[PDB]
């Protein structure tokens, strides 16, 4: 429902229907340029406001679709850092972005199958682009998303402490254990695998994991 | 266009992913050195550039 214009005009309709606020109009002329004019040298910049304005009506993964439209079609560009940062940001808000947790219960049990992939994106941003504007903020994400999977796994470690596969207690701890040496969740599940040891009468191996706890009291 | 005079350049739900500190790392006993570093955790730290989260520029 949009006709053809001069190729420098549809930017403004992309720019200014972005300035409308009713979010069903912004993409409408954002997309209206690169269909009639994909041959402009600025069509990858149209993708940058596209991945931007895709978020607005809870219509997220076209951003990730337009994230990869930057990647494969266009070999040489420094703005992949934005594309890599918006990659995990698209990948994150599929997990926990609803307002149903408004009453005091958060959402780490809600499975981060794509915020699994958000960790993949933010790890490649901090290794692909060092001084880009998003490296620091993604590093903040890489701290919790590690732990966001951990308490998820610790819930299973609690669930395995609940149901009673005490071997599967320690592995849910061991899956949390061997990857990262930083979480406090690593400290507190460390007696539970050893409580699993204590219920499996591996009290010495419990104590050996309590020996791990012992110097970690800091 | 429609919100609680809100919801234009911000995040829905909650924004727990910024306000926390880095995870309080542990000081292992001598000899009990597990490969707890054995994850994919090639996360290199460099001071460039830009802001964080909602305050970070999004052009």
């Amino acid at each position: 429902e949009v006709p053809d214009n001069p190729p420098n005009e549809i930017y403004a309709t992309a720019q200014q229907k972005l300035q409308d606020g009713n979010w069903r109009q912004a993409i409408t002329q954002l997309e209206a340029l690169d269909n009639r004019y994909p041959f402009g040298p600025y069509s990858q910049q149209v993708q940058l406001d596209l991945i931007y304005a895709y978020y607005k009506n809870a219509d997220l993964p076209l951003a990730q679709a337009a994230i990869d439209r930057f990647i494969r079609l266009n070999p040489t560009h420094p703005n992949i850092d934005y594309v890599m940062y918006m990659r995990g940001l698209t990948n994150m808000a599929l997990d926990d972005s609803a307002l149903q947790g408004f009453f005091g219960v958060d959402r780490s049990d809600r499975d981060p199958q794509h915020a699994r992939a958000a960790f993949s994106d933010f790890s490649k941003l901090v290794r692909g682009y060092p001084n880009s504007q998003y490296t620091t903020d993604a590093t903040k994400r890489l701290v919790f998303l590690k732990d966001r999977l951990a308490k998820y796994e610790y819930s299973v470690a609690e669930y395995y402490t609940e149901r009673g596969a005490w071997v599967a207690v320690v592995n849910r701890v061991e899956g949390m254990l061997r990857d990262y040496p930083d979480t406090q969740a690593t400290r507190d599940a460390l007696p539970l695998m050893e409580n699993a040891y204590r219920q499996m009468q591996m009290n010495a191996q419990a104590e050996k994991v309590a020996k791990i706890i012992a110097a970690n009291s800091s | 266009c429609s919100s609680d005079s809100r919801y234009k350049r911000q995040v829905s739900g909650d924004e727990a992913y910024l306000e926390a500190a880095p995870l309080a790392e542990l000081h292992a006993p001598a000899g009990m050195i597990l490969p707890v570093t054995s994850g994919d955790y090639a996360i290199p730290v460099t001071n460039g550039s830009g802001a964080v989260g909602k305050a970070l520029d999004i052009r």
Partner: protein, 783 residues
């Protein structure tokens, strides 16, 4: 020559230097008129230059080009039921799409290919006609005109090499249709060569079971009948001979469980060869050894066909594998709820061997979840190690969101408003809260119940319901049978098996009948309690505190949590009392829902919802009538209005209510009908027996994308409520409501749409045998 400049005219979609980079006549090259002619053909060999006109002025080139991108429109005109993009994939199979280049030399060949697309599907009877227009600054078009005449229609199959079995009886076993009778219209008669291949394998199984180990199919040949429709078929088969499954020679890595296998492979020796049951029995060990740990129970049967006595000998060759596979599990995407309840319904646990069956029982209460749009799996073996797998359960979650309201009778009476919201354990808690409160001009309400169904390990699901009610009947404030009840009651669930979910609890049913209306079987329960009130006024008063005691049995054996098709589930609730109650009674109702599929893809499946009943006392008492059973306008009953099937509120001569205006409240009142009148209200009985048989039916127009909860359903609600204690002594002109054969009959249809605003069921029903005191509502908008 060596060129100074090259002119690149008319490109507009591709890069200009891309024309230069593809040019072998580039700047700085020794450029001759041969390579000028080579640039004509090679930029024609790019396929993108509608003309390539390479010329030069002595040495400086001009390559004047019309381009033939952009293919702007590919207009698919004529494909009525055929979707457009499946032709575009054949267009994409030609390397052609929107944005590509449009070489008009290659028109009819892909038109032949799109006719070959029309050829392959079941037609040929359509020309295709690519129409090309030029457009602004470069662009080109593809209007494709389809002459969609007719398709290939099944005429006949002939099975040659068949010797004992009719072709036509195999048609009844087949999927290819050369027969749909006018009084047996159950399908449609069109080609596909996969229905060919399936009916080969239908026949292959149909000779695998009877004995024919020597069966094979030589070939088959569709008559390419000269009519562009005609499908006469010869099927060249070799029937062979009914050979005998005369022994099982199971062997291999049998892992010390061959008796368990031989339990499966109990054959008759000398029985005719049934490899279909072998085809089943070959799977059953892969369940059994797949239960035993063997993730890869590599099993090879061999019917050692012993033609010397026309028998076969069933060699089996087994590679078991490793056992202790279950090391860890992965999930995928519960972004409204918890993993651990999905883990607590995934009883396949780690540090174990492969229960392949145990993996799938983890998916059964994922199937009994209700919050599943699919229970779907990726099972990744962790490589390098046959004790290690990581199943990554990739699913599609189910959606939420609903609110609705009703209207009347308000805006002429007092303000009627009802409150209450719903978001489903609330949007992923596992510990749920039930809240109600409302008010019209007659009442003030306060209703609460709390539930933690998922703290526990067993499956215990307690609901304790507490209630204050201000039942007032504010006519003046009286005059039309008040019935007030406030206090607390409980219902439950459990395991005894994981199907079982024991529903029980306590009660405080504190029923304070005051100012009661004079219908007679109101006093059916009040004769047991010993009240001696005024029989013609509505100032009378009766108070009980029914300390009730719930017990039941929910054998929750029903397939899906949203759309089940097989099994036998109960969801039962009733009550008896002990010495200590005001009423030493029992209230029993019973439901029965057994599901068995006739359609094995379950699009045609029965749906059960009946309600039984037998209520009395343990000596000297009886079931109360506010806990009576009210049928019509409900889930199990249609065709009759709200509280209509049952024993009847047969009014007495109401003469006083202590408030009766100028001619109102016809309760057989003083102001009209001054009599012992059987009026239109069902008092309910102590012995209910009512039912509804419903059916799963799909639709050949509704999209499968959401049809998991779109269904058409049909019913015939048959039955009555009767009262084993409805005496004929007072009821002289009033019917025998102790008969089981008071059998009301009403039949009709459900027309269900998946509405995302809650269940909106508009049911049509016809009361053919509409009994006494029943109302009618054919367009029931009830639930």
């Amino acid at each position: 020559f060596v060129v100074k400049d090259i002119h690149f005219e008319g490109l507009q979609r591709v890069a200009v230097g891309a024309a230069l980079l593809s040019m072998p006549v580039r700047t700085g090259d020794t450029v001759n008129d041969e390579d000028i002619s080579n640039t004509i053909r090679a930029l024609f060999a790019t396929g993108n230059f509608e003309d390539v006109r390479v010329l030069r002025d002595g040495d400086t080139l001009l390559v004047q080009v019309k381009e033939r991108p952009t293919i702007a429109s590919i207009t698919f005109s004529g494909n009525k039921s055929v979707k457009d993009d499946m032709l575009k994939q054949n267009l994409e199979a030609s390397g052609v799409r929107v944005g590509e280049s449009l070489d008009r030399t290659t028109i009819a060949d892909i038109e032949k290919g799109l006719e070959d697309f029309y050829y392959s599907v079941g037609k040929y009877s359509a020309s295709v006609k690519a129409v090309v227009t030029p457009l602004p600054r470069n662009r080109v078009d593809l209007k494709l005109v389809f002459q969609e005449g007719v398709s290939a229609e099944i005429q006949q199959i002939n099975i040659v090499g068949n010797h004992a079995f009719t072709t036509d009886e195999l048609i009844s076993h087949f999927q290819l249709r050369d027969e749909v009778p006018w009084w047996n219209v159950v399908g449609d008669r069109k080609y596909q060569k996969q229905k060919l291949a399936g009916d080969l394998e239908t026949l292959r199984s149909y000779y695998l079971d009877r004995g024919y180990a020597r069966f094979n199919i030589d070939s088959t040949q569709v008559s390419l009948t000269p009519d562009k429709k005609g499908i006469y078929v010869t099927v060249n088969i070799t029937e062979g001979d009914q050979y005998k499954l005369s022994g099982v020679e199971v062997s291999g890595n049998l892992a010390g469980h061959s008796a368990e296998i031989e339990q499966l492979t109990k054959i008759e020796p000398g029985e005719l060869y049934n490899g279909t049951k072998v085809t089943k029995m070959e799977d059953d060990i892969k369940k059994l050894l797949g239960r035993y740990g063997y993730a890869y129970p590599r099993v090879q049967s061999m019917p050692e066909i012993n033609d010397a006595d026309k028998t076969v000998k069933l060699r089996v060759n087994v590679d078991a594998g490793n056992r202790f596979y279950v090391r860890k599990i992965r999930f995928e995407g519960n972004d409204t709820s918890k993993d651990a309840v999905l883990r607590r319904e995934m009883r396949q646990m780690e540090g174990a061997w492969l229960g392949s069956d145990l993996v799938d029982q983890g998916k059964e209460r994922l199937n009994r979840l209700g919050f599943f749009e699919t229970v779907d799996t990726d099972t990744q073996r962790v490589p390098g190690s046959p004790d290690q797998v990581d199943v990554v359960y990739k699913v599609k979650e189910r959606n939420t969101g609903s609110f609705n309201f009703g209207i009347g009778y308000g805006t002429e009476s007092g303000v009627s408003f009802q409150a209450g919201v719903q978001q489903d354990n609330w949007l992923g808690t596992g510990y749920a809260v039930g809240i109600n409160g409302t008010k019209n001009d007659y009442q003030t309400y306060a209703e609460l119940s709390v539930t933690n169904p998922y703290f526990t390990v067993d499956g215990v699901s307690l609901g304790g319901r507490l209630f204050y009610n201000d039942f007032q009947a504010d006519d003046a404030d009286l005059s039309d049978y008040t019935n007030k009840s406030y206090g607390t009651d409980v219902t439950l669930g459990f395991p005894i098996n994981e199907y079982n979910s024991l529903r029980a609890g306590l009660g405080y049913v504190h029923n304070s009948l005051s100012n009661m209306q004079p219908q007679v079987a109101m006093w059916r329960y009040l004769y047991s309690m010993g009240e001696h009130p005024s029989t013609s006024d509505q100032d009378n008063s009766f108070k009980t505190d029914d300390f009730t005691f719930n017990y039941g049995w929910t054998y929750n054996k029903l397939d899906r949590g949203y759309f089940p098709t097989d099994g036998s589930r109960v969801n039962l609730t009733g009550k008896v009392t002990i010495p200590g109650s005001d009423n030493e009674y029992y209230k029993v109702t019973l439901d029965t829902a057994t599901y068995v599929p006739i359609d094995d893809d379950h699009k045609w499946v029965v749906l059960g919802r009946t309600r039984w009943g037998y209520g009395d006392g343990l000596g000297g008492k009886e079931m109360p009538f506010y806990e009576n059973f009210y049928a019509g306008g409900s889930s199990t009953v249609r065709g009759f209005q709200s509280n209509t099937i049952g024993p009847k509120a047969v009014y007495f001569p109401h003469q006083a209510s202590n408030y009766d205006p100028d001619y109102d409240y016809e309760c057989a009142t003083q102001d009209g009908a001054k009599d012992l009148c059987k009026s239109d209200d069902a008092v309910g009985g102590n012995a209910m027996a009512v039912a509804s048989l419903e059916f799963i039916t799909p639709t050949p127009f509704i999209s499968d994308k959401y049809a998991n909860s779109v269904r058409t359903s049909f019913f015939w609600d048959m039955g009555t409520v009767w009262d084993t204690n409805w005496d004929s002594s007072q009821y002289s002109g009033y019917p025998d409501y102790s008969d089981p054969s008071n059998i009301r009959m009403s039949a009709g249809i459900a027309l269900q749409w998946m509405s995302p605003l809650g269940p909106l069921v508009f049911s049509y029903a016809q009361p053919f045998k509409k009994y006494d005191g029943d109302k009618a509502e054919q367009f029931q908008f009830n639930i």
